Amino acid sequence: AVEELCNVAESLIVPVRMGIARPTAPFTLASTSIDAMQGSEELFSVEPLPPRPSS
Amino acid sequence: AVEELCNVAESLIVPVRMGIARPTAPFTLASTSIDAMQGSEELFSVEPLPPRPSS
Numbered sequence: 001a002v003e004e005l006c007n008v009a010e011s012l013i014v015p016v017r018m019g020i021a022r023p024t025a026p027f028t029l030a031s032t033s034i035d036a037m038q039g040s041e042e043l044f045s046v047e048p049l050p051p052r053p054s055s
Numbered sequence: 056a057v058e059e060l061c062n063v064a065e066s067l068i069v070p071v072r073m074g075i076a077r078p079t080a081p082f083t084l085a086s087t088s089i090d091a092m093q094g095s096e097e098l099f100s101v102e103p104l105p106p107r108p109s110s
Binding site: 017018019020 | 072
């Protein structure tokens with residue numbers, strides 16, 4: 001778990017220290033877990049892109 | 056001259072590739088030599104900070 005967390009942290013920090021961060025508008029932070037569940041629900045409960053029908 | 060230009064270029068490019076560039080506002084580019092002489096004149100015709108009088 002510690003090794004995987006190290007890799008995740010490196011993935012998150014590389015664009016910041018290479019100056020290639022993609023601009024994003026500011027957002028507020030949820031003060032309750034019921035709001036934090038949403039947003040994450042939209043992000044994760046998604047389906048892959050379906051294949052092209054026929055050919 | 057080539058070596059000094061290399062050092063100047065490195066000085067100019069380090070903040071960009073370390074993600075520490077100081078935000079600035081957009082500006083137009085002069086199309087005349089006199090305008091380019093201006094601005095540069097304000098930049099280079101300055102004086103060093105004088106010492107504190109007495110003690």
